[PDB]
Ligand SMILES: Nc1ncnc2c1ncn2[C@@H]1O[C@H](CO)[C@H]2O[P@@](=O)(S)O[C@H]21
């Protein structure tokens with residue numbers, strides 16, 4: 679009766695490959711783009727950087743969008759979240775996640791997920807939540823991690839996303855500094871980049887628990 683490592687939406691073989699493939703292409707295009715190389719000094723400390731190798735730590739199997747990290751019940755609020763009706767009712771159910779953008783930072787590379795109202799019901803409201811969630815609506819950090827730097831944890835991907843969103847609401851994202859096939863590229867500075875997709879990418883996933 680102990681909880682899983684974490685709850686979340688796990689993409690199907692099909693959707694996972696599609697998103698992973700898209701993420702890779704983005705890292706290759708972004709790494710080659712001139713506006714990116716122009717700011718390489720703000721990306722790494724101490725040219726041409728292959729981002730695919732930079733984000734060497736990548737999800738082993740299928741991609742996923744985490745909701746509540748439970749650490750088998752050792753995480754705060756893990757017990758209260760798992761006992762919600764909406765969680766038990768939604769357990770094993772199919773969902774469609776809307777990917778609105780892909781982003782890159784010195785620490786992580788991931789995809790922004792925009793949760794619908796029904797999906798937000800499965801989002802945690804635990805006491806100890808990120809502080810970057812000030813003014814930004816709940817579920818704003820929802821994301822799919824695509825890769826991380828060598829000494830970075832995937833939990834950082836949500837934090838990086840919030841920081842990027844915090845900058846967009848302030849109107850400091852500036853105007854596109856380039857234009858990729860799937861959409862416009864934005865430079866937010868300090869090594870942060872955001873590809874806003876012209877057309878939202880829909881991925882199919884199943885809500886469930888991963889027990890490691
Ligand atoms: N202390 C923590 N708080 C919230 N999520 C955590 C966490 N430790 C790990 N995770 C997340 O649980 C999942 C597997 O560890 C990953 O999905 P993600 O990109 S949100 O970052 C990871």
Ligand SMILES: [Cl-]
Pocket residue numbers: 785829830
């Ligand atoms: Cl670090």
